[PDB]
Every structure is written in C-alpha cells, then in structure tokens.
Design a protein around this ligand. Structure first.
Ligand SMILES: CC/C(=C(\c1ccc(O)cc1)c1ccc(OCCN(C)C)cc1)c1ccccc1
Ligand SMILES: CC/C(=C(\c1ccc(O)cc1)c1ccc(OCCN(C)C)cc1)c1ccccc1
Ligand SMILES: CC/C(=C(\c1ccc(O)cc1)c1ccc(OCCN(C)C)cc1)c1ccccc1
Ligand SMILES: CC/C(=C(\c1ccc(O)cc1)c1ccc(OCCN(C)C)cc1)c1ccccc1
Lengths: 209, 12, 224, 223, 208, 12
C-alpha cells in the first residue's frame, strides 16, 4: 500500500551534512573529537527542525517537546550514523567526508564506543533495514525516550501509538513474509538506548580530558 | 562473584 | 481456549517465592538494606540460572553463550522480578514478601534514585495491566535479547529471540484481540529496563569502591 | 535595651529580593536552575553591599574583604533561604515569588541538595530562631569563613570576636532561660559549611554537564 | 574542674604507632599505605573511646553507628591536629611518622595536609589544652549532623551535656576570656570542611 | 566570574 505517516517522515528527512574536517590541523585525538562535536552540534539543529515535522509532536507542550528531545537526542544521532554505515564493512560514516575505521577509532580513543555502534550496524544489516524503517524508528525512539518529567503522558502515549501503528502497517504490507518483522525492529531499541547512554557518559567523562 | 555464581550454577 | 505451549511451559518453570530474610539483630541502616539485597540477589541469581535452562532453545546453546546471555541480562531479570511483584502496590517495592521498601526506607539506604527509576517501570506496566503470562515471557526475551558483544552462534540466539517473540505475539493475539498492538507495546518497555539495569549495575560497583560497607559491619562489631 | 551592633545589622538588613520567574518559559530542570542563578547573582551584589555595613569589615584590606566573601558567599545565600523558610513546612522560600516543595525540587534535580537545606531549616525551627540571631549569624559566618589567603589574621580574628560578643550579649539579655543558646547557635555552623560546600560543588558540577546551554538552544529552535 | 572533662581525660586512648616498613622504599603508595593502616587501628580504639563518652552507650546502636559514621574523619584529623600543636609546619600522625612539606608533596597530600595545618595554626594561637581537645572531640562526635538519627532528643541531650562541660570548664579555668568556649566551637566548621576534603580525597584515590 | 563580580561591586 501507501502509508500516510511514513511518506511524511520520508520528506521530513534532513539533507546530507558534512563534517568538514580541518586540513590545517594535524591528525590527532582532539581533532576527531573537535570535528564530531561541531558535527553533532550542526546535526542537532536540523534534528530539532525535523522533530517538529513528526505527526503529533508539535501538538505536545513545549515542556514535553523538550523533555523528549532532552532524552532522545544522542539516540537520534547514533541511529543516524548507524544507518549511513549499513553498506560499509567495519567502517562508520559520520559523514561522507569523515569515515572512521578501526585504526582511526583507535587514535580518537573511541574503539569501545564505535564498536558498540557497530554492533547496531551489524544487526540492522542482517535485517536489511530500509529507509522507511529507519525514519519510522528514529521517530519512535524520540517518542519512547522514557523521560522522567513528562507533563502530558497520554498525549505522548498516543504519539507513541500513531508511530507504532505506522511501523506495524508498513510491515504488514511490505513484509508479510515475516509476520514479526515489526517486533524485531522494536527489539533493537534497547541496544540503541544502551549505546546512547555510553556515548553521553563518554562525552561528559572526557570534558575533563 | 557473579562470574563464579553463573559458572558454578551452570556446571552442576 | 488452549494457550501457547511455550508460555505454558514458562509458567510451570516460574520459581517459587524467595524470602529476603533480614537479620532482626542488625540495627536499621544503609548497609543493612544493601547487605540484605545483596544476599537476596545472590540466591535469586542461582534460581534465575536454574530457570534459564528451562527456556526452550537455551540449553541447546554452547555453555559460553548461555554464560554470556546471563552475564548481560541478570540485572534486567532481577529488576523485572521486583517490578512484577510490585504491581498491586503504591510507591512500594516488594523485593520479597518480607522486604518491602517504601520511600523512607529507600532514603535510609541511598537507593532513592535507583528505586524511583524502578518505580517508573512499575508505573508503566501498571498502566498496561501486565499479566503473569506476559511477565515470564518478557523475562525470557530480556535474556534472549541481551545484546552481549561476545556471542558465538549469532543465528542460534536470534532463533531463540524469534521463538519467544512468537509466543508473546501469539498469547497477545489470542488473549488481547482488543489491542492488536499489545505485543509491541510490551516490547517498547524493554529499553527502560535496559537503562534501569545499567543504572543498577553502576550504582553497585560505585559503592564497592566507595567501600562504606565493611566499615559499618566493623562499627557494629566493636559497639556490640 | 539592645546591643548596638545587632541593632546596626537589623537596619543593615537588605530588602526582599524576588526571583521573577519568566512565565513564558515552560517549567523544567533548566528553568529552575536558570531562575536561581539569576537570583543568586543579584543577591550576591546586595550581600556585598551588606557586608560593608558590618563593623570592622571596611577597615580590612580590599584583598581580605574579597577573601572572606569568596569563602562565605554560598553560606550567606543559604542561611538566607533557610531563615525565609522557618515559618513553612517542607518548602523553601528562595523568594516570595519562588517557593520549592518536594515535587518541584524533583523537577529541578535539587532533591538531595534541597533536603540538606531543609535539614538546616528543621534545626532552627526547633530553636525558634530570631531575626536578631539570623542577621548576626550571617555576619559571623562571613568573619569566620576560614579562607587560606588572609593578609591580616589578627584583624579577622578581632572581627570574629566583636561579632561573637554581640551575639553573646544579645543571648544574655534576650534568652536568660538558656545560658547555652549562643553556643547552640554557634554549633549550627558546621552544617552550614558542609551544606554550602555541597551547593558549591553541585554547581561547578552542572556547568560540566552543560544541559542548560543545551536547553536554551532547544527553547529557541522549537519556537 | 568537672566530672565529664575528667572522665574524658581518662578515656583518652594511649599512643599508637605507624611503624612504617623501613625495607619498603619511600613513595606515594607507602605513605598512603601507612596512613590507611594507622587510621584502621586508630578507628578501633576510637570506637572503644566513644563508648566511654557519658551518654553515648544509652543511645540505640543505630544512632551510635550513625554518629560515628558521620564523625570518624573529624575525630581522626582532630587527633593529628592536637599531636601537632608544639611543632612548626609539621603533622604528627604518630611519634614515629611525622610529615613535613616535602613528605607531604610525595604523598600527593600537599593541599590536604596544608588544610590540616590551617587547623593546627588556629589552635596554636588559642593555646588549646588537653581538656579542651578531648571535650571538643566529644562534641564533634555528638554534633555530627547525620540525616538518619533515630532519637533526636537523646542526641540533642548528649550535645547539651557535653557543651555544658565545655562551658563550665572555660567558666572556671578561663574566666579572663568570657568567650573562649564560643571561640572553641567556632573551629569546628573548619574541621568538618577539612574532614570532608579528606574523605572525598580518600575515595578519589581509591578509583586512582 | 565569581571573583569578578565581587571586585566589580566593592568598586561601585
Ligand atoms: C561517538 C560519536 C560521537 C558523537 C556523534 C555521534 C553521531 C554523530 O552523527 C555525530 C557525532 C557526538 C560527539 C559529541 C556530542 O556532543 C554534542 C553536545 N554539544 C553540547 C557539544 C554528541 C555526539 C561522540 C560521542 C561522545 C564522545 C565522542 C564522540
Ligand atoms: C536496586 C536493588 C538492588 C538489587 C536487587 C534487585 C532485585 C532483587 O530481587 C534483589 C536485589 C541488587 C543488589 C545487589 C546486587 O549485587 C549482586 C552481586 N552479587 C551477584 C555478587 C544485585 C542486585 C540493588 C542494586 C544495586 C545496588 C543496590 C541495590
Ligand atoms: C541551592 C540553590 C542554589 C543557589 C541559590 C541558593 C540560595 C539562594 O538564595 C539563591 C540561589 C545558587 C545557584 C547558583 C549560584 O551561583 C550563581 C552563579 N554565579 C555566581 C556565577 C549560587 C547559588 C543552587 C546552588 C548550586 C547549584 C544549584 C542551585
Ligand atoms: C590526612 C591523612 C589521612 C588519614 C589519617 C588521618 C588522621 C590520622 O590520625 C591518621 C590517618 C587517613 C587515611 C586513610 C583513611 O582511611 C582509613 C579507612 N580505611 C577503610 C582505609 C583514614 C584516614 C589521609 C586520608 C585520606 C587520604 C590520604 C591520607
């Protein structure tokens, strides 16, 4: 069939952002980090603008729109890179002009963190994750981000369903051959959350280094 | 232990 | 009218109640509360493991993979146990029938953040009216779905997740026709369980190195 | 009749200061914290003017005036909210237009730190603490704030001594039933220091977590 | 003087020695190792000591543990502060372990020992006397401001009784300074401040 | 700047 909510997310999808790594600065630890920070920083801006285009999101209270975003942001970044990395082997595509393999990830000291990010890539590869599912899953993570101080819980739950129902209907139509594909998709979020938390902690930890 | 408990408990 | 064979199996394999059994002689304190949960956890693990063997697929897996799944999900299974036991209570956590922690007792043990997070899991499943059949199946899936970075037979573990998932989706298809999306709703709680587990595992290692524990036992020893 | 210094301090006592929470901003962790940092910054200023009136304090070097302030500022701020809160139950009056209960302390991520301040409220509630004792205690908390960078130690001790005298004298006149009241008062500072130190830590601690400069960009973007 | 001050004077533990291993070359580890071994053994006599404070033993065990759990570092540091009184810029942890600026540098403890010296410096100026030291130690145990007190009234009473002893001591033996008792009580914040530094410093170099 | 503020004040 055609699904209203996925087609909107498809056109809501942001445009390619580039890391523009400074060629004047000599290859190093700080560099990789200075670039990813500025990259993430620039990504967030269009992620917020993106969030408004999610059906139902903009009818939430500003307090809740924030809470969901204050919770989810890293998850949305990480799923981002995970997706761009699907057709690659043991490499991560933070942007087209910044691709990290084992030995670069050694220099930045992100081996453990990127290896985690690759566990997520490794999984979605198996499933043949498709863009229609990527976008719908980003949305779901934002909505299911388990924030502690939601004002309107019902409104946020209803948003969760609308997105869930979208995934469900999509999979019912495009993947009848696996009646549990949708569930399988939702079962990959706990890793995304796990990995999200590490990244955050890792980020705040290195604000002393 | 955890490692020790899991191990001991699977073993026998 | 007939249930799922795996769900039914899981229900008979569900371990009997375990008692916390606090020492009445030891005066109430942070360390008591901790001490009491540690020994509880340790006996619960032993049965949790015993339980694992009864999950279909599990025992067929290599001993290293069995180890690795338990190694990743133990704390999710412990925590999901207290949560279930807590469903028909208000702002209290039933670690055991003889060990229920309300706010005050949590303030005394420095588990105010930790238990608040666990109460968050309780609040959500309360909403859905989580049912035993669902709890035991969810425990199985938490184990199967535990994302260990160290798996040997990846396809076999996936096959374990697929079976258990299918049992949930079938129970939820027969017993909850009014909610075609109940299984996914259930699965959508997994991440909070994961987040919460990691919190717990953190807190625990975080207080060994903050070794207040043996100091307390030594005070009592001298003072009594 | 009254002690001259104590009298001087009651008139030295600054006027109320309001938090003036932005009503357009939605209620959240960072709002709370935003609101309290602005408040503090303004109270600091009047706390600094206030200290000038303390007898002796102007006669110190500018370096010493600065040292005592750098050490006692958070202690004064807290003794403030603590006095303002005495008449209330489980609530902290940061200002008349900003009052935190258990529920809001949770929103702001201040639960642990607010309870510590409420622990200070509880004690002074029990001793039916009076404005005369509050104002003089702020002066003492400043004079006795134990900075390492002092130029003139004798001069700072002499200020502790005079302020101490004023307290003893006031307790002798106003509380003859309890000849230990002055000491009891003095015995609450160790908690004020401890608690002050928590406040200070928590703050430098959330400058690193920098979720405030996040939240600000989320506010701007989402509108 | 006073029945309670006398009782505290006699309760005072006997000297304890660091007995560092002389075979082990000097380093950061050894210093920290020797000081851990000393505190541990001091803590045992310290605990025995609290039982001999008037009123301590009538509180509930929960309360007794609580106050010690709160106060233990203050009582340790106050100890070294007192043994250090007749020395110049040096900390007498025990007769056979005395740390000067250089040794303090090698332990990674310059900032902390400095702060401890700041206490010594204050008490030197007042000419702190053993009777004041031991009553103050007592008070530090009892004014320890734990959150989880069971009997607030009984613990309050223990504060009041020990205060009254400080009061009476300074009233009879130090009438020339009508505020000496208050002066003494004003050194406690720096103790609690410094005691927190040390506890935080200890758990810091556990990780490290 | 905490120090800054305090200085700024005792100037004005
Ligand atoms: C792991 C890659 C990464 C970030 C990242 C992930 C995906 C992506 O598409 C782009 C970047 C990362 C880095 C920094 C960061 O901080 C942003 C917060 N502002 C306040 C600087 C967020 C993510 C990172 C996270 C923590 C430490 C080091 C690097
Ligand atoms: C939150 C409750 C809890 C534990 C718990 C949870 C559920 C349950 O049924 C029983 C206990 C807990 C406590 C200790 C613990 O340590 C295990 C170490 N053993 C395996 C050596 C694990 C969980 C705990 C976890 C971390 C710190 C403090 C307490
Ligand atoms: C405890 C409330 C509080 C402050 C406060 C206390 C009493 C009062 O009357 C007003 C405010 C607080 C907050 C910030 C602060 O520093 C301001 C930053 N400037 C000085 C650069 C000081 C106190 C605070 C302190 C640390 C972290 C978070 C909040
Ligand atoms: C200030 C010297 C000191 C200790 C000390 C203080 C007074 C005294 O009379 C003797 C020693 C010290 C060191 C360790 C310590 O922990 C003991 C508790 N066990 C569980 C290790 C306590 C005090 C110390 C504390 C922390 C880190 C490094 C040094």
């Amino acid at each position: 069939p055609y699904n209203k909510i996925v087609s909107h997310l498809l056109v809501a999808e942001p445009e390619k952002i580039y890391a523009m790594p400074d060629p004047t600065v000599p290859d190093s630890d700080i560099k990789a980090l200075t670039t990813l920070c500025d990259l993430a920083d620039r990504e967030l801006v269009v992620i917020i603008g993106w969030a408004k285009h999610i059906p139902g999101f903009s009818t939430l209270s500003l307090a809740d729109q924030m809470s969901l975003l204050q919770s989810a942001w890293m998850e949305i970044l990480i799923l981002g890179v995970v997706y761009r990395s699907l057709s690659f082997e043991d490499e991560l595509v933070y942007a087209d002009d910044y691709i990290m393999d084992e030995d670069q990830s050694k220099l930045a000291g992100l081996l453990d963190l990127n290896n985690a990010i690759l566990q997520l890539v490794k999984k979605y590869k198996s499933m043949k994750l498709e863009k229609e599912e990527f976008v719908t899953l980003k949305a779901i993570a934002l909505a299911n981000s388990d924030s502690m101080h939601i004002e309107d819980v019902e409104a946020v739950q209803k948003l969760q369903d609308v997105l869930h129902e979208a995934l469900q209907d999509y999979e019912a139509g495009q993947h009848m051959e696996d009646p549990r594909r949708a569930g399988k998709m939702l079962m990959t979020l706990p890793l995304l959350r796990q990995t999200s938390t590490k990244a955050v902690q890792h980020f705040y930890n290195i604000k002393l280094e | 232990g955890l490692e020790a408990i899991i191990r001991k408990a699977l073993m026998g």
